[PDB]
Amino acid sequence: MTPESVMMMGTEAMKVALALAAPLLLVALITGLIISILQAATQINEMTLSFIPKIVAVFIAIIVAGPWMLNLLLDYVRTLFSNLPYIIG
Amino acid sequence: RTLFSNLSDQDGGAIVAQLTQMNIPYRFANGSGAIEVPADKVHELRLRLAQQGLPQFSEQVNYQRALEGELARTIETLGPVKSARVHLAMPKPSLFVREQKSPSASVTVTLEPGRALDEGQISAVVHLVSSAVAGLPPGNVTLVDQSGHLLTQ
């Protein structure tokens, strides 16, 4: 195949990767930033207190959105293996 | 005199554009879908426009006869044509229900000695006749000379 086809395939690949990661990364970032802003405003000098809520938030994300990130990825993979006999050439 | 009547807006517009280009005066009959033009230019203009691809029994018969006559007259304005006869043969409202019919025309021309119609003139005649009759495709127009030579391919 041409390099451009490889670039397009990688493009849909990292688009799916970003769609998978953002539901989790965004909530982790929001929780960390909120806790850090509260800490700076209250002068409670301790970094490790930001770690405990984040996990819960991350876990919350999964239990609220685990199905979707499970399904969409499959809808990609089942396509990719089905496009295998048509990318060669 | 009337150059064309019953024109589509598209055809009308195209015809007006061509008349303007040729610097020919014209008057589009108000809501008559007709374009009266210099009487002495009517036939020449019909032919020229045709070259550019633009645009009871007794009555029918008369109509048909009148139409045939007019078409003949228009064709006779061509330089190489001494005389023209047009016969229109539209079958009476298809009596047969299943079978489908279509109008045809036969054009016979007497040419001036030593003169011939060129491909353009031939095409103009075919178009003129086809455009004048509803449902008459160009392919159903046969053009022959006095010797019976088929001019239309």
């Binding site: 998978l20 984040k54 293996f81 089905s82 | -």
Partner: protein, 208 residues
């Protein structure tokens, strides 16, 4: 012109000697085997399916894929030979044609040109007259390239999974947690859910 019986059986046994080479370089065994090895490497499980299991699967898939070619060889070449209708030489010549057509169907014109120019062959009119000594290496090279293409494409979803889990672990501050231990079960889950084995075998068969 017909070879005597002893010469015929000598040829038959000597040809039976070359069986693995024919399987590897004339059939679809090599591409399936390469893709299977790359897939096994891609799941992070370097020795989960034993080599014998994958070899047997590749052999059965190759037999199924090459069943039309074998049927053509039987009907056109082997059957008249077994009924003594044609000699061994002409039977072999007739049997070469379907396999040659199959191999030409799955070769790349550039590799054929490379091997023709390298072997100083004269101009050849159409695909009808291309020597087997020219077609075999070109077909092998094309099979290698196609197998690598398929394996590289297959490597993508597991890469996506590894990257997303690594990013999720890193954004939590977990600096010294390796992502392979968490990624391997999820790679297995992904391959199971998409019905990976049958889908990949169907894709390999459809590409031939």
């Amino acid at each position: 012109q017909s070879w005597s019986l002893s010469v015929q059986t000598l040829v038959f046994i000597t040809s039976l000697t070359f069986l693995p080479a024919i399987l590897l370089m004339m059939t679809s065994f090599t591409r399936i085997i390469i893709v299977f090895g790359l897939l096994r490497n891609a799941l992070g499980t370097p020795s989960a399916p034993p080599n014998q299991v994958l070899l047997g699967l590749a052999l059965f898939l190759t037999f199924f894929i090459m069943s039309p070619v074998i049927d053509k060889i039987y009907v056109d070449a082997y059957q008249p030979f077994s009924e003594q209708k044609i000699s061994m030489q002409e039977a072999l010549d007739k049997g070469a044609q379907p396999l040659r057509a199959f191999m030409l169907r799955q070769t790349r014109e550039a590799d054929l040109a490379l091997f023709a120019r390298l072997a100083n062959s004269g101009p050849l009119q159409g695909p009808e007259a291309v020597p087997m000594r020219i077609l075999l290496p070109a077909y092998v090279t094309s099979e290698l390239k196609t197998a690598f293409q398929i394996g590289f494409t297959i490597f993508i979803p597991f890469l996506i999974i590894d990257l997303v889990i690594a990013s999720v672990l890193m954004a939590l501050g977990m600096m010294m947690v390796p992502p392979a231990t968490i990624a391997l079960p999820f790679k297995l889950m992904l391959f199971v859910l998409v019905d990976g084995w049958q889908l990949l075998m169907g894709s390999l068969a459809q590409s031939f």
